[PDB]
């Protein structure tokens, strides 16, 4: 599926899931501040930047 259910990142970063999956692929253009919060959360939750459902 992926290293961790991204709702976990979303929730720890305190932000609606809509942001996180968008952030992940950089939503072509997204606001920096959003990224900074997710970015912090990411490392902390043993997660790795661009882990979309592509392995299985």
Curated annotation (Swiss-Prot):
Residues 6-25 bind DNA. Coiled coil: none annotated. It comes from the Bacteria. Residues 1-56 form the HTH lacI-type domain. Repressor of the lactose operon. Binds allolactose as an inducer. Removing residues 1-59 results in loss of DNA-binding activity but retains tetrameric structure and inducer-binding activity. Deleting residues 340-360 results in loss of tetramer formation, but retains dimer formation, inducer-binding activity, and DNA-binding activity (if residues 1-59 are present). Homotetramer. This is Lactose operon repressor. It comes from Escherichia coli (strain K12).
């Amino acid at each position: 599926m992926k290293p961790v259910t991204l709702y976990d990142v979303a929730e720890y970063a305190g932000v609606s899931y809509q942001t996180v999956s968008r952030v992940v692929n950089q939503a072509s253009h997204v606001s920096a501040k959003t990224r900074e919060k997710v970015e912090a959360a990411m490392a902390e939750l043993n997660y790795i930047p661009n882990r979309v459902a592509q392995q299985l």
